Design a protein around this motif. Structure first.
Motif, PDB file in Angstrom:
ATOM      1  N   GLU A   1     -27.334  -9.900  21.712  1.00 54.39           N
ATOM      2  CA  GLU A   1     -28.779  -9.685  21.536  1.00 54.39           C
ATOM      3  C   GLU A   1     -29.373  -8.800  22.648  1.00 54.39           C
TER       4      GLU A   1
ATOM      5  N   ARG B   1     -36.267  -8.463  31.042  1.00 52.99           N
ATOM      6  CA  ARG B   1     -35.664  -9.772  30.936  1.00 52.99           C
ATOM      7  C   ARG B   1     -35.153 -10.285  32.271  1.00 52.99           C
TER       8      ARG B   1
ATOM      9  N   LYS C   1     -27.415 -21.759  24.592  1.00 49.54           N
ATOM     10  CA  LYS C   1     -28.759 -21.242  24.379  1.00 49.54           C
ATOM     11  C   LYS C   1     -29.677 -22.302  23.813  1.00 49.54           C
TER      12      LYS C   1
ATOM     13  N   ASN D   1     -26.570 -11.927  26.822  1.00 49.64           N
ATOM     14  CA  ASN D   1     -27.240 -12.893  25.951  1.00 49.64           C
ATOM     15  C   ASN D   1     -26.722 -12.857  24.525  1.00 49.64           C
TER      16      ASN D   1
END
Ligand SMILES: [Cl-]
Ligand SMILES: [Cl-]
Lengths: 409, 409
Positions: free
Chosen positions: A107, A146, A349, A382
């Motif tokens: 991602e 991020r 996650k 991620n």
């Protein structure tokens, strides 16, 4: 509007003269050569997507709307701004991280590089990125920095702190061989990736043993690790001055159950930003000297504040070298000619409703060269569909080569 | 050996070529003109005693032995070092402080000046001082940098924080008129310099009411002020990198009696260095932004960390202006053409055995110009036989004039 440059003056944001119009063929932010054939300003970003998340962008009127452009708007609107970033490092970091994110079909990914001696942020990158010279068809999710806005459970990266604390408090000797057989707290299973009957303190880091570290943690008051992680900056603001900058998630608990005490020792029940983790690793690299971070250029010396005894941190940094040697989980991060000290691993996650889903964060954090760290680096990948270990090696290898650091091994 | 300069390059320590000898008339660190009539090095200090405590000195072999010379020995032994100090400010500070110490026949005095926007130490001075160009017949007690090595109970200087906390926690409204009649906790008398039946929040600062602030303190949990003073840096290291740097004395108590809670609100039961107090006042001046201090030159911007809400601190800074206006205890600190925000007062000295003796510390702390503070200043006078208020006025007046700050009143 002032120019944003890198630490050596390389231009990263430059104001460019454009004309406005207040004929049908030409016109259908106008170029100078076309206004004459028939006053305002706009921004040009020479590194484009490489530093987009950090630098941000302005609107039509030359007001800062994201990133550095917004964060230092008043300073720029009239002084130049030299960032701490080194564009060569930024470009290599981005290149490796971007291609790793692509290759593992993840991602997103994030990377922060910090100078161990100064607190300077030398590189700060994410992928997917976007071209700030043309904001169009770019989805909002590709715009967050991020490194400062996203948080994750730091997992194995806290483990070196567990060993430092436990040595410091005499819960364990450098001599000790630990029972690392899997066990239960209530019905909660505590186990490692593979079974190891017993391990050395080094082994506990080398094989990233959750069993090992949970026994160290339970041998001490719940407040010990709370104290150590905080000294290293976890749960504390990073203070760059950047909009959207987050300070993680941090327990505020007087009473800890046994399981909570155990899961803290292997990095669950708190969340960090890639940037806070970078600062943890810079405090490891200085052998216990805490220094505030900076996205602007800073001249040495920066004394900082000693938060943990040097000899303990040196000892644990040595133990950490094993992670990137045969038998360690970060072997794929190894750099020909250099000693490195790393932790690598995985965290589950959190889903929409705040519940764990079956998707992962992969992370590698570390310092190099291990005999006297100069750089702290954090690589976070991620939801790829030790994925981060090779990326760390390639990035850190580039950094060491670019910066002319003497080979070490 | 590198040159130590002030923030603009003015020389403060310079290495000077001297010859050694390994005849009876000349010889009886030798001058060049006398070695020829018949290799090593020594230090020359152009500001001499003005900056002696800060800069320190080297020994025969050019090793740093005190102050900056020792603290940055490895950096200097080979780079120059630009201090944050501005020598014009340093010289005026020293001049006023030295002569005030002489005039009041005090044991010593100390002064620290901090840039509100950067954390920079712009002046750091004590008296009595000594000439580092000739260390001979100088007593050891005249050599300590007292700004960082000496500690005292901060007394009334904490009071603005009490008012900020209490407003913030809704213990009191800006509207409130307080009962400030003297009273007893057990048999402990709580009273002000003079009797005031009732006071406004402003009045509580204006007349420096211990009664006022003790009632605010007792209206809240004992942890409130512990939290606020810590946010402002009390009990925390100052991190300049200077040898002998102290971090005060700070309670570590879960359970507070009523009297202890009261005496904390008027600045007893902790001790500060002049430097920590300067940092308190710089955090007041920025309206709640905490910035780390620096004795080396630093380029803006310095974002720092917001530790208290701006509107609360602005409110209290306004209240503080009353202290230097007619009716306030710091009236003698007033500066023609400038609004200032100060606290002035007194603390009893601790004797050999740790018991109070009948000798006093006088102190004035504050920021200027009050409409947007640029400088935080602390003046401390030790055992003179509002003694510090005139000194503060004269010093701060000079600073504002030298730095070309627009008149304010
Ligand atoms: Cl996500
Ligand atoms: Cl004394």
């Amino acid at each position: 509007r002032g120019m944003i440059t890198d630490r050596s003056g390389r231009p990263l944001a430059v104001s460019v003269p454009v004309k406005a119009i207040w004929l049908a063929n030409a016109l259908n932010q106008v170029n100078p050569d076309m206004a004459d054939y028939i006053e305002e300003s706009r921004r040009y970003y020479p590194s484009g997507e490489v530093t987009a998340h950090l630098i941000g962008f302005t609107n039509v009127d030359s007001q800062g709307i994201e990133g550095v452009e917004k964060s230092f708007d008043k300073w720029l609107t009239a002084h130049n701004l030299a960032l701490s970033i080194d564009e060569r490092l930024q470009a290599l970091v981005y290149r490796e991280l971007n291609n790793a994110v692509a290759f593992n079909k993840a991602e997103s990914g994030s990377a922060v590089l910090v100078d161990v001696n100064t607190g300077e942020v030398l590189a700060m990158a994410n992928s997917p990125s976007y071209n700030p010279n043309n904001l169009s068809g770019t989805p909002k999710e590709a715009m967050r920095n991020r490194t400062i806005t996203d948080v994750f459970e730091p997992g194995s990266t806290v483990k070196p702190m567990v060993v430092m604390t436990a040595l410091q408090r005499g819960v364990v000797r450098e001599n000790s061989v630990l029972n690392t057989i899997p066990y239960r707290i209530n019905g909660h299973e505590i186990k490692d990736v593979a079974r190891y009957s017993e391990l050395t303190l080094t082994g506990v880091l080398q094989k990233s043993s959750n069993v090992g570290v949970s026994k160290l943690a339970l041998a001490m008051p719940s407040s010990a690790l709370v104290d150590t992680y905080s000294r290293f900056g976890l749960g504390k603001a990073t203070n760059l001055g950047l909009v959207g900058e987050r300070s993680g998630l941090y327990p505020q608990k007087q009473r800890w159950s046994d399981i909570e005490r155990a899961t803290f020792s292997f990095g669950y029940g708190l969340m960090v930003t890639p940037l806070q983790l970078a600062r943890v690793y810079a405090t490891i690299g200085s052998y216990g000297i805490y220094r505030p971070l900076s996205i602007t250029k800073v001249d040495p010396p920066v004394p900082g504040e000693r938060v943990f005894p040097e000899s303990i941190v040196r000892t644990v940094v040595h133990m950490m070298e094993s992670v990137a040697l045969p038998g360690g989980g970060g072997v794929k991060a190894a750099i020909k000619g250099y000693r490195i000290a790393i932790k690598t691993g995985t965290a589950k996650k959190v889903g929409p409703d705040g519940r764990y889903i079956n998707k992962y964060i992969a992370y590698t954090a570390g310092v190099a060269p291990a005999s006297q760290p100069r750089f702290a680096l954090v690589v976070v990948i991620n939801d790829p569909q030790a994925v981060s270990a090779p990326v760390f090696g390639a990035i850190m290898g580039g950094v060491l080569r670019t910066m002319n650091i003497e080979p070490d091994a």
